[PDB]
Amino acid sequence: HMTIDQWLLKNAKEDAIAELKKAGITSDFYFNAINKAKTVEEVNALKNEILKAHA
Amino acid sequence: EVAHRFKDLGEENFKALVLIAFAQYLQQCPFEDHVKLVNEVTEFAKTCVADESAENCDKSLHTLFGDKLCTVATLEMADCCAKQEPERNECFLQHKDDNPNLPRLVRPEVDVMCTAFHDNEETFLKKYLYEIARRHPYFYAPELLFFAKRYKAAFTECCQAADKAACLLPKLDELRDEGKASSAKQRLKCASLQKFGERAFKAWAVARLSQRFPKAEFAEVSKLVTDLTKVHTECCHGDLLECADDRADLAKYICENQDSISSKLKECCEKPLLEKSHCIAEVENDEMPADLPSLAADFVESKDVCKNYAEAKDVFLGMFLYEYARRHPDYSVVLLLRLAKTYETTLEKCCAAADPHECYAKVFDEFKPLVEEPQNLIKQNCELFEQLGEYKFQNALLVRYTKKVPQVSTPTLVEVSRNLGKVGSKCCKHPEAKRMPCAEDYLSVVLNQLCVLHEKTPVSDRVTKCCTESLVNRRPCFSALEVDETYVPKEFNAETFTFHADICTLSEKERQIKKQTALVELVKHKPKATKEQLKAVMDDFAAFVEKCCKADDKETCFAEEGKKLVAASQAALG
Ligand SMILES: COc1ccc2cc([C@H](C)C(=O)O)ccc2c1
Ligand SMILES: CCCCCCCCCC(=O)O
Ligand SMILES: CCCCCCCCCC(=O)O
Ligand SMILES: CCCCCCCCCC(=O)O
Ligand SMILES: CCCCCCCCCC(=O)O
Ligand SMILES: CCCCCCCCCC(=O)O
Ligand SMILES: CCCCCCCCCC(=O)O
């Protein structure tokens, strides 16, 4: 049974990966990287970073 | 809120801090105005602390500061204080002086310094704190405080020794140098951040944090990069509070996540808030995980290389920098940067070619030359340094750079060469693992110091051509300079090769400087001399300052044997 912390982190990752998919990122390479994040903040900083670079 | 800071800081620290603060905004007020001003801010605390319900106690430190910071006769920074706090403080800050117009502060004699320090510590230390504070208005206040605590230690120590001088001077010198360079490095980042925006800055931090936290995942490092870019961006505005709050938060965040980030952060994370971001910024690199694969899979051999890079270029590049950097704490950041630049160019040059893979298959080969360049450069110089001492090494450099750019002013050649040499002793101690990164650190500032000195006094085509290059190519450019074969000898001037007993009494450091000054002048008057020839002279010259200075009759020794030495050197050269 997940901690609230573990639940939030898992969510943020799915969230962020969908949100990247909807912007046009297709590569496991980025989703993997999102997946190795340990913190929700890490999840969103890197999502943000991937979006800025997609332009 | 101000009670928060006082119990947290502990009178001494709070007071030291506030003094510094005023000194950096009010650069021109005398020490005694600030002392009581600190007092009229303290001793409101420790009571405003006891009574939390008191008046103005809850207002922002900016408010409490800026309202204090509007009490006193003298004044176009006047337009300020009309505004009603933030929506105001962009005011004071916008007028601060790059470098202010006040007495180039000369150091007292040892005897004196130690005297004033034993007769009273508080005043002599705070005095000097205010003083340094005002000439360095962008100098993060806590870092300055840490130096002040290092100053007390050095004074406490050397003022009770046989050698008061041989002890303290070297420490003041080493402190001064760290300070100045700490400051120069702040400016450097800030300026660079303006000239090249966030992107170059981020690339830098990515490289740096990856070396330092090799176990952290990309997302951890990237996160730290974002937060750090923020911190420097705010700290580059110039406001302690905005800067400090961001630093303290970033530090808190690293510590909460230390187990993931680095096994080297136990001590730092259990330090008081004041010191924690400081202790972090200088933690040793962690050990990299044990079985890192080659970077070939993901960055060369993979089929998806171009799909991936196109989808988010800067991040792909960041991940490459990340993977390279954490595997190479031996490299300098600028080297890693050169490597990523190359990689980048290559992906650009062929993810649009008929066979992408065909081009980039060989890309790591392109890194050997680049790694090899500084590597070799360190070997020969540290080798050369190892043959000769710090002193003679400095002289080798004096000769090398005077031959390269004689147009430069002797004082500058002496300072840079002396510093370049100092750099050698600080860095060659370390093994071939730690050397390049240590060189970069010390070298960039020494180099910029030269550049700044050169900016406000152009003299050489090739030097400014080097100073306005990318930070990545700055040192390579400097290293590409050739001996100036075109340069015509300076004319003799006797006064410059004549010495007096006075040198026997100078600081050893000050003595060396005098000899080194003459050496540069020598090269400038005989640019063709062989350094086989220079040896002979340098050797006659040392024997000259040995014969005199140990001789009963010194004025005459230096004088008519100065003749002996000159004619002996005028002959044998030209
Ligand atoms: C952080 O400690 C410092 C920083 C800068 C300094 C500058 C100087 C003087 C003005 C100098 O020689 O230029 C002295 C001591 C200093 C200590
Ligand atoms: C915070 C105490 C500072 C002590 C000042 C040291 C004097 C050295 C002056 C100089 O480096 O040219
Ligand atoms: C406003 C109180 C003085 C600034 C706060 C003390 C410095 C710690 C912040 C940091 O980690 O860099
Ligand atoms: C000192 C080299 C660059 C900083 C690396 C360490 C990160 C410290 C973050 C901070 O507290 O500001
Ligand atoms: C100086 C050329 C190196 C390019 C590296 C790109 C830096 C951005 C990394 C990131 O956004 O996380
Ligand atoms: C006087 C010693 C010169 C050695 C060169 C130092 C290399 C710095 C790292 C770099 O720019 O890539
Ligand atoms: C006028 C002084 C020139 C600065 C020396 C440049 C340092 C780079 C090391 C080297 O290649 O020698």
| B472 and B508 inside one domain | no
Amino acid (one-letter) located at B204: W
Domain final residue pick, B135, B156, B187: B187
Domain spans in chain A, listed from the N-terminal domain onward = 1-55
Q: How far is A7 from chain B (nearest CA, A)?
A: 17
C-alpha torsion angle, residues B235, B239, B241, B247 (rounded to 10): 10
Cα B152 to middle of ligand 2, angstroms = 11
Domain final residue pick, B372, B397, B421: B372
Report residues whose beta carbon is within 6 angstroms of any ligand 4 atom: B 208-209, 212, 228, 231, 247, 250-251, 277, 280-281
| B249 and B280 inside one domain | yes
Contact B132, B151 (CB under 8 A): no
> Does residue B46 belong to any structural domain of this protein?
yes
Radius of gyration of the CA atoms of chain A, in A: 11
Question: Rounded distance, CA B246 to CA B251, Å?
Answer: 8
Question: Rounded distance, CA B286 to CA B216, Å?
Answer: 10
| B279 and B300 inside one domain | no
Burial level of B397, CB count in 10 A (0-12/13-18/19+)? buried
- Cα atoms in the 13 Å half-sphere on the side-chain side of B152: 13
Nearest-5° angle of CA B564, CA B567, CA B571? 135
Contacts of B534 (CB under 8 A, 6+ apart): B399, B519, B522, B523
Question: Rounded distance, CA B219 to CA A42, Å?
Answer: 6
CATH number at residue B137: 1.10.246.10
Radius of gyration of the CA atoms of chain B, in A: 27
| B1 and B91 inside one domain | yes
Kindly list the residues from chain B whose CB atom is less than 8 angstroms away from the CB atom of residue A38.
Answer: 217, 219-220, 257, 260
- For B491, the token pair is 């004319």
Contacts of B350 (CB under 8 A, 6+ apart): B356, B358, B359, B360
> Does residue B183 belong to any structural domain of this protein?
yes
Contacts of B533 (CB under 8 A, 6+ apart): B526, B572, B573
Contact B527, B487 (CB under 8 A): yes
The residue assigned the tokens 């021109």 is: B28
| B131 and B221 inside one domain | no
**Technique of determination:** X-ray
Question: Which CATH architecture does the domain made up of A1-55 adopt?
Answer: Orthogonal Bundle (1.10)
Q: For residue B133, how many other CB atoms are within 10 A of its CB?
A: 23
> Does residue B240 belong to any structural domain of this protein?
yes
Domain final residue pick, B286, B316, B338: B286
% helix, strand, coil for chain B, step of 5: 70, 0, 30
Contact B264, B285 (CB under 8 A): yes
Question: Rounded distance, CA B156 to CA A53, Å?
Answer: 54
- How many domains does chain B divide into? 6
| B160 and B259 inside one domain | no
| B125 and B206 inside one domain | no
Which of B539, B448, B227, B477 minimizes the C-alpha distance to B338? B477
Contacts of B445 (CB under 8 A, 6+ apart): B181, B184, B185, B188
Annotated binding site of B for (4Z,15Z)-bilirubin IXalpha: 230
Distances (CA, A) of B318 to B209, B225, B491: 12, 10, 55
Atom of ligand 7 nearest to the CA of B475: 8
Question: Rounded distance, CA B370 to CA B335, Å?
Answer: 7
> Does residue B33 belong to any structural domain of this protein?
yes
> Does residue B144 belong to any structural domain of this protein?
yes
Question: Rounded distance, CA A9 to CA A14, Å?
Answer: 9
Distances (CA, A) of B3 to A33, B21, B51, B65, B522: 44, 18, 9, 14, 63
Residue numbers of the domain that contains B408:
373-484
Contact B201, B192 (CB under 8 A): yes
- For B124, the token pair is 């002599």
> Does residue B147 belong to any structural domain of this protein?
yes
Question: Rounded distance, CA B389 to CA B378, Å?
Answer: 16
Question: Rounded distance, CA A46 to CA A13, Å?
Answer: 10
Q: How far is CA B350 from the centre of its chain?
A: 39
Question: Rounded distance, CA B259 to CA B448, Å?
Answer: 37
Which DSSP helix (H) or strand (E) runs through B59? none
Question: Rounded distance, CA B222 to CA A39, Å?
Answer: 12
| B199 and B238 inside one domain | yes
Question: Rounded distance, CA B213 to CA B215, Å?
Answer: 6
Contacts of B572 (CB under 8 A, 6+ apart): B533, B536, B537
Output the CA torsion sign for B22, B23, B26, B32: positive
Question: Rounded distance, CA B220 to CA B261, Å?
Answer: 7
Atom of ligand 7 nearest to the CA of B408: 1
- For A41, the token pair is 């903040």
| B526 and B537 inside one domain | yes
Contacts of B119 (CB under 8 A, 6+ apart): none
- Cα atoms in the 13 Å half-sphere on the side-chain side of B108: 10
Q: For residue B224, how many other CB atoms are within 10 A of its CB?
A: 25
- For B108, the token pair is 């007292």
Cα A39 to middle of ligand 4, angstroms = 19
| B360 and B257 inside one domain | no
| B422 and B342 inside one domain | no
| B477 and B389 inside one domain | yes
- As a three-state string, the secondary structure of B435-501 is HHHHHHHHHHHHHHHHHHHHHCCCCCHHHHHHHCCCHHHHHHHHHCCCCCCCCCCCCCCHHHHCCCH
- For B117, the token pair is 């320090």
Contacts of B195 (CB under 8 A, 6+ apart): none
Contact B179, B147 (CB under 8 A): yes
Determine whether the shortest distance from the Cβ of B276 to ligand 3 is under 6 A: yes
